[PDB]
Each structure stands twice: as C-alpha cells, then as structure tokens.
Ligand binder design. Structure first.
Ligand SMILES: NC(=O)C1=CN([C@@H]2O[C@H](COP(=O)(O)OP(=O)(O)OC[C@H]3O[C@@H](n4cnc5c(N)ncnc54)[C@H](OP(=O)(O)O)[C@@H]3O)[C@@H](O)[C@H]2O)C=CC1
Length: 329
C-alpha cells in the first residue's frame, strides 16, 4: 500500500506519518522543510525507506494536489489532514474550498486511490456556544446544528463552523460526483499528546497542546491560562485510528468519533503537580471562577460504535499529559 498524507508537517499528521511507517506502509507527505521531516524519521530509528515528500504551498488554491498526484500515480490512500484565534480575514470559504480542491484533484488525477480518510473533528459532531446541548446525547451520526451564517462571528465559532462545514463538502461531494474511491471520517476531539519525533519550539506548541503548555508558560508570560472543558484524545490514538480508517473495510462511510474521556484544565494541572513536582514552582493557581464547568457546554459522547470498530484501548489522560510534559522537560 502507498499512503499519501497532506500537510505532513502537522501535529497529528506527523504522528500519522510515524505510525504508518511502523506498519511498513509506504508514505508520501505534502509540505508547504521536506528535509526537516526526513531527517526526523531516519534519526528516529524508524525503517526509513517508506517515505518521500511533495511541496504544496497552499491547500486552499485550485488544483493544489494535481501535480502531486500527477508526479506519483501510485498512491492508493489519501489522508487529508491539513486544514483557535486567527486574524479575521477569511476562515470559512478556504476551509471548504481547500477540501473541494482535494476532492477535485483526487478524482481528476488520482485514480489509483481506493480509500480516502478525511481528518474532520468533534466540532462537526456536537454543538458549541449557543448551540451547546449540555447533558444531551451525541454519537457518530450526530451533527453540529451550526450554519455558515452562525459561523465566523468568532474565530472560535468560525473554526467550529469551518470544520463542521468542510466535512459536509465531503458528504455532498461523494453523492454529487459519486467518486470511485471510498471515504472515511476521523473526528478527533481535543487532541493531546507528545510530538511525533521532536519539538521545535518549546514555548508554543500546537493550538491543542497549549491546553497543557499554557499551564507551564503561564508564570513566564504572566498570562492567566485560558481554561477548557470537553473530551480529550491522545494523538497516538488518533494516528492509530487513521490507519484503521483505510486498512479496515468496515470503516467505509463511518465517522470515527475519536474521543476518550472528559477533561478540564484543572484536571490536567493536578496530573502535572503530582507527576512532576519539580514544576510546582512553575505551575500557576487556577481561578475556580474562570473555570468552565463541564456539565454546561458538552454533550454526552456515545462513541460506543467507534471504540468497538477501532478495537484497541486508548491512552489515558495521565499518560498523555505525562508523555507531553516529558518532551518539554
Ligand atoms: N486538538 C486537535 O489537534 C484537533 C485536531 N483536529 C484537526 O486535525 C488536523 C491536525 O491539526 P494539528 O496537527 O493538531 O494542528 P497543526 O496546526 O499542527 O497542523 C496544521 C497542518 O496544516 C498545514 N497547513 C495549515 N494551513 C495550510 C495552508 N494554508 N496551506 C498548506 N498547509 C497548511 C500545516 O503545514 P505547515 O505546518 O508546514 O504550515 C500543518 O501540517 C487539523 O485539520 C485539525 O482541524 C480536529 C479537532 C481538534
């Protein structure tokens, strides 16, 4: 098998590129640095003859992957991973077009592709903010009731909208165009965990791991840490689920809800104080009033279907946080 991965230099994608190579599959990643990632795998001890790369400056531009799928027609898996606070220019339309630019380039040029795995999100599963359904039931088939108009009112709700709607463009495409490849959706919740190989900037991680990292850099930046609630998932569990999304035949047309257990910025902090006492002078005191309560925004995730299909045991929060902190010293 030959697995293509868009935006390979990303947080989840680097873990995706890693666990695939550990399964012996070939890999071909996209890059905006190609030697930054190839020097990373070989030095990591991985079996390093299963990876090359392509250069793609932008995903939201038309035909972004055509010359990538016209230089290598051998690919048979497409892992579309590349897709918070922005600048408030435009976040919705490039997110839906960036996906469409790939569904138009995988169909028009990549015909050796059989399975496509679109990395979506839990934001396309349950509602946020004014559409919060606290205490209510959500599962693989549930959908965020947010609309395009109700989105991009916030860099937060806009990201929530841009992720719920970009998955819709795949659902509309597979029926409007009726392609020859099969689709699978991996819907990761709040992804935590350590980098695939090596951290590059210890002061700022990805937007998701800053949930952990802000607790460390708070006393340096003198920034009161923004607290969060919701469901977490370890980046290694998401990486393993992306393989099952194309290696297994029962994941076809399934929205793999990649959520473990609830979490909280306060709950994550307690793990760091116990397992890393040398940091007790670097960890802050969280305000009990600034803390969002769980039973108020988040629904009840019913991913019983996904856990049964994945079949493996996920990484607990303690191991996820411990492995995360171990990298940043
Ligand atoms: N907690 C989480 O991590 C969550 C993850 N997800 C989804 O999973 C995916 C992985 O995100 P994650 O790894 O955590 O975050 P990162 O920011 O680390 O990943 C971003 C990736 O997308 C690429 N990219 C972004 N914008 C562009 C662009 N305009 N043109 C080309 N490439 C671009 C980046 O390439 P480069 O870095 O080289 O610029 C990078 O590889 C995302 O699509 C995210 O929405 C879903 C829900 C939550």
């Amino acid at each position: 098998t030959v697995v293509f991965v868009s935006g390979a230099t990303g947080f989840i994608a680097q873990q995706i590129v890693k666990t695939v190579l550990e399964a012996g599959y070939k890999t071909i990643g996209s890059v905006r640095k190609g030697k930054y990632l190839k020097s990373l795998i070989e030095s990591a001890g991985l079996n390093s003859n299963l990876f090359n790369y392509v250069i793609v400056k932008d995903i939201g531009a038309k035909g972004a992957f055509n010359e990538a799928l016209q230089a290598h027609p051998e690919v048979t898996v497409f892992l579309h991973t590349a897709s918070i606070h922005d600048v408030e220019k435009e976040l919705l339309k490039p997110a839906i077009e960036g996906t469409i630019n790939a569904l138009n380039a995988v169909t028009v040029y990549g015909k050796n592709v059989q399975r496509v795995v679109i990395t979506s999100s839990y934001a396309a599963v349950a509602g946020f903010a004014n559409l919060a359904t606290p205490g209510k039931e959500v599962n693989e088939e549930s959908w965020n009731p947010i609309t395009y108009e109700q989105a991009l009112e916030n860099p937060f709700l806009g990201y929530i909208g841009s992720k719920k709607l970009a998955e819709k463009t795949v659902w509309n495409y597979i029926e409007e165009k009726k392609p020859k490849w099969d689709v699978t959706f991996v819907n990761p919740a709040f992804v935590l965990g350590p980098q695939a190989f090596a951290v590059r900037d210890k002061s700022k991680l990805n937007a998701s791991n800053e949930i952990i990292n802000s607790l460390l850099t708070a006393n340096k930046t003198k920034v009161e840490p923004q607290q969060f609630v919701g469901y977490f998932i370890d980046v290694r569990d998401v990486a393993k689920a992306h393989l099952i999304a194309f290696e297994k035949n029962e994941t076809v047309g399934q929205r793999l809800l990649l959520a473990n257990a609830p979490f909280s910025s306060a709950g994550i902090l307690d793990i760091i104080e116990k397992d890393f006492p040398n940091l007790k002078s670097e960890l802050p005191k969280l305000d009990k009033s600034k803390s969002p309560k769980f039973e108020e925004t988040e629904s009840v995730v019913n991913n019983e279907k996904t856990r049964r299909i994945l079949g493996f045991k996920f990484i607990d929060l303690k191991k996820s946080v411990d492995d995360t902190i171990k990298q940043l010293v």
